[PDB]
Design a protein around this nucleic acid. Structure first.
Ligand code: GCP
Ligand code: MET
Ligand code: MG
Lengths: 117, 470, 267
RNA sequence: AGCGCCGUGGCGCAGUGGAAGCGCGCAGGGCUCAUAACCCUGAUGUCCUCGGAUCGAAACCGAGCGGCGCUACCA
């Protein structure tokens, strides 16, 4: 009754490698289709890879060298361990701040897991 | 235009509130279901057992709504050494019209005497059939003293099995055998993961679980599929608890006693010390009705070593500041429910794991500390908790003289040495003090594979006493 | 109206260590004004400049800022300052900077007083500054004793009482210090009535708090109690805190419990 | 929960009581036939928020926020 559909909502990360530069436009779409706020996602991307740039426009402009496969892989890791829980298939969970860190909670279930780093 | 807080108030006072307990009620006529007892304290202790990292705090939270919270930064995520406590109020709908499976409702400890039915279409209210306490037992293969002691507290059992994982979880069987050791039958089997299986897989898992329960002492265990995360099928769990599990024999005849499992210093930091509070022993009472203002003695207490290496035992005399149970301060204490006995003791006794598994007696009784204990043991065929990859689960050997082993005497977690081995009898010498009151059902664990491993049960038959220094 | 150097005479002396501000590197070195001194330009030659031979000298000059200095010879006939940069000890550079911070900070209050009362800075210096640097060796320690002990100006003739009371307000507002002495005391008690003992111990300790220095035994943990005190002269706090220690030992040695000290009184 | 640390220019340190710093980075220029090395010029800041003595604070202090380490679970 509740879940007739029982992720399939990952936007294909179509990137741009302009040699010295790299532009990722899909950053907002992957922010939406994964129900993820933009700033936390982009800081996690910067924490995975020690490269520096800016955010331009609804896109991420990082001046460094990476194939689309490797940034795709980094997004795959973030998808594997943040947007969807390993134990059960779900995605509607989002960031919350339970005594200073980011403590995750869910909506479909009501989880309380301490994932911050 | 009423605020949600105004709505919840209006319902709370409409539900009768939480009436203050009488200061001196006639205790001869009091039953555990009495209105003064049932509304403000928990009379039955239910304990959760399960495999590691499957969810036993979450099931309790889904039942009652009281968080175990989990603490100690590093321990926020892996495992928690201390037990997890929560109070649930069992409410049955007074309307027969509503379906029987969903009439039951487990609420938090702050609910009213008769809250309204959340079922859309029923104006009937909820009657309180019982209040229950929950003792979350850690289920790790290293942490064994706390699980045995929390068992030694509780009176009802709750087994969790995950479906998609392998059927024969070994430490779940270890939990079940530990429960069987202390003389409990009332065990309810839970299927934690049911949404994530198919129809055929769930039935196969049920068949496996049934195939496991044929040789154990427990035979007619109820099995019910629940979900700690999805938070459904809660009412029927309350149904099974109410029907299957009655109140253990507990009246006011037996002399007063306490068994402390947790210690809690009450020192609110940042606050000035001129406004402080005593030290609180988190203890369970199996026998004894305790009233606001009492002198009690922690029998093993101060444990000293003299210049000559002899262990001196100084009981911790103490006057009870308060008996914190459930939500509010209570005038009297009910046997069969964990309570924070706050006393004049210096909180440095209740800061760390210091009062974990220690016997207490009010003034007017003289339990005996011992140093050598005669023990009557009996072992099982194989060790529980080792996933041998297909080869003959390890067989228990016969005990050797002079071997350090963990002997859980009731709640006390002690490491004793065997001084003699007989056909069914042994003698244990203790360096960590232990007292004997009546029988104190005992669990035995050895060190064969690094961490402790349960082997068999035992009961004290005799012992060499020590006289406390006054 | 910036003038009137801190020291005694109207030309710098010989063989001393000072600190200049750099303005220009034109042909032979640095002709630099002095902020350790009044206003007079002094020479350093590029030979008296660089310890290591360098490609671009500017990286060692950094025009516009302040740099270590030494006056060797002084033209006390028409004014020339034979000065160098490399002729300073490796350690004594920090002595030069600390001397300069003292002198500069003394200059700031005198400039404030001069721009308030419209007396030229030289007069306020003359009446006040060098009598202080004579009695106590410096005006900074003179101000430090004046904030605590008012005998400093006894025997010094001021231009006006207004300058006095204004600069007293300024020393009490700007030179305001009291180091936080901290201790940590363990309760090891295993006794029966310990909370009442702790309450009475803090009662006794906080009853020692004087008007100027207040001792507050704050709680952070069951064993660890923190002693915070404002040592106004960095000597009364230790004795106050030892008295507190004795008071907790007194309360604890008779009820039945035991207590121990982890961190004794330290600034 | 309290205490020890902190509040970027892209970074790390810093003087923090005259009001924008140094190196690493980046744009640009210079030397060279040419490249690297070397040499010069730079635009980046609410030096986190709110108030206060102060001509004036980014600095000196405090009625709030955020991020760091311990006291350790502090009913
Ligand atoms: N899919 C699914 N996940 C669950 C369920 N119940 C709990 N979990 C997961 O378990 C996690 C919580 O585990 P936790 O209760 O801490 O395990 P634990 O009780 O400490 C294991 P132990 O008692 O041996 O110490 C949650 O993050 C949640 O996602 C369930 O029914 N289904
Ligand atoms: C901490 S002791 C457990 C029961 C108590 N009423 C709570 O708190
Ligand atoms: Mg638990």
């Amino acid at each position: 009754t509740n879940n007739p559909e029982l992720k399939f909502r990952i936007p294909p990360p179509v990137c741009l490698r302009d040699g010295k530069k790299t532009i990722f436009s899909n950053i907002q779409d992957i922010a939406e289709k994964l129900h993820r706020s933009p700033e936390h996602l982009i800081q996690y991307l910067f924490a995975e890879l020690g490269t520096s740039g800016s955010v331009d426009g609804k896109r991420l402009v990082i001046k460094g060298k990476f194939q689309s496969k490797q940034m795709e892989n980094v997004l795959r890791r973030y998808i594997l361990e943040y947007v969807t829980c390993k134990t059960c298939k779900s995605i509607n969970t989002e960031l919350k701040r339970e005594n200073r860190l980011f403590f995750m909670v869910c909506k479909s279930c009501g989880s309380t897991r301490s994932v911050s780093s | 235009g009423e605020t949600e807080e105004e709505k919840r108030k209006r319902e709370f006072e409409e539900g009768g509130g939480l009436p203050e307990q009488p200061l001196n009620p006639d205790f001869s006529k009091l039953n555990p279901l009495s209105a003064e007892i049932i509304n403000r304290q928990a009379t039955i202790n239910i304990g959760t057992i399960g495999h590691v990292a499957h969810g036993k705090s979450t099931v309790v939270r889904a039942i009652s709504g009281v968080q175990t919270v989990r603490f100690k930064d590093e321990l926020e995520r892996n495992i928690t050494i201390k037990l997890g406590y929560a109070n649930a109020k069992i409410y049955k709908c007074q309307e027969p019209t509503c379906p029987e499976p969903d009439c039951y409702r487990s609420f938090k400890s702050d609910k009213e005497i008769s809250p309204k039915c959340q079922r859309p279409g029923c104006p009937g209210r909820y009657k309180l059939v019982r209040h229950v306490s929950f003792v979350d037992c850690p289920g790790h293969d290293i942490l064994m003293s706390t699980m045995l002691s929390g068992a030694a507290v509780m009176d009802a059992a709750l087994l969790l099995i995950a479906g998609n994982e392998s059927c024969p979880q070994p430490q779940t069987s270890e939990h079940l055998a530990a429960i069987e050791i202390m003389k409990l039958k009332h065990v309810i089997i839970l299927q934690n993961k049911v949404d994530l299986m198919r129809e055929e897989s769930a039935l196969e898992h049920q068949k496996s679980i049934l195939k496991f329960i044929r040789g154990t002492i427990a035979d007619g265990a109820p099995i019910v599929p629940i979900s700690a995360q999805l938070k459904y099928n809660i009412d029927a769990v309350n149904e099974f608890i109410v029907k299957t599990i009655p109140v253990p024999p507990r009246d006011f005849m037996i002399s007063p006693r306490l068994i402390v499992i947790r210690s809690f210093d009450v020192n609110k930091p940042g606050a000035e010390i001129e406004d402080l509070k005593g030290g609180v022993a988190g203890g369970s009472i199996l026998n004894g009705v305790f009233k606001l203002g009492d002198e009690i003695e922690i029998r093993p207490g101060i444990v000293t070593k003299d210049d000559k290496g002899k262990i001196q035992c100084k009981p911790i005399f103490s006057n009870i500041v308060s008996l914190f149970a459930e939500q509010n301060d209570l005038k009297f204490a009910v046997p069969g429910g964990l309570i924070g006995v706050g006393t004049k003791v210096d909180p440095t006794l209740c800061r760390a794991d210091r009062l974990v598994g220690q016997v207490v007696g009010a003034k007017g009784h003289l339990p005996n500390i011992y140093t050598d204990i005669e023990i009557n043991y009996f072992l099982l065929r194989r060790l529980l908790g080792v996933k041998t990859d297909g080869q003959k689960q390890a067989k228990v050997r016969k005990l050797e003289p002079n071997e350090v082993l963990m002997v859980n005497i009731g709640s006390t977690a002690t490491g004793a040495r065997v001084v003699a081995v007989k056909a069914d009898m042994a003698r244990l010498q203790l360096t960590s003090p232990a007292c004997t009151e009546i029988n104190e059902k005992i669990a035995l664990s050895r060190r064969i594979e690094k961490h402790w491993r349960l082997i068999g049960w035992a009961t004290i038959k005799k012992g060499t006493t020590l006289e406390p220094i006054a | 109206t910036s003038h009137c150097r801190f020291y005694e005479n109207k030309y710098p002396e010989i063989d001393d260590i000072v600190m200049v501000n750099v303005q220009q590197i034109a042909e032979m070195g640095a002709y630099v004004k002095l902020l350790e001194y009044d206003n007079i330009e002094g020479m350093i030659l590029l030979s008296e400049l660089s310890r290591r031979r360098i490609r671009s000298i500017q990286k060692l000059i950094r025009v516009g800022k302040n740099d270590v200095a030494v006056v060797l010879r002084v033209d006390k006939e028409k004014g020339y300052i034979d000065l160098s940069k490399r002729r300073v000890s490796s350690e004594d550079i920090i002595k030069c900077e600390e001397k300069y911070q003292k002198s500069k900070t003394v200059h700031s209050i005198l400039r404030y007083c001069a721009e308030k009362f419209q007396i030229p800075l030289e007069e306020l210096y003359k009446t006040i500054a060098w009598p202080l640097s004579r009695k106590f060796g410096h005006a900074y320690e003179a101000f430090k004793l004046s904030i605590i002990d008012e005998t400093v100006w006894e025997g010094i003739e001021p231009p006006s009482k207004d300058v006095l009371d204004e600069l007293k307000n300024y020393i009490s507002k700007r030179l305001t210090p009291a180091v936080k002495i901290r201790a940590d005391v363990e309760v090891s008690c295993f006794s029966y009535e310990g909370i009442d003992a702790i309450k009475d111990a803090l009662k006794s300790a906080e009853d020692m708090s004087t008007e100027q220095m207040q001792v507050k035994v704050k709680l952070v943990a069951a064993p660890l109690y923190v002693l915070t005190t404002q040592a106004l002269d960095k000597q009364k706090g230790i004795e106050q805190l030892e008295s507190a220690i004795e008071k907790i030992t007194e309360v604890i040695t008779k009820y039945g419990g035991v207590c121990n000290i982890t961190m004794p009184p330290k600034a």
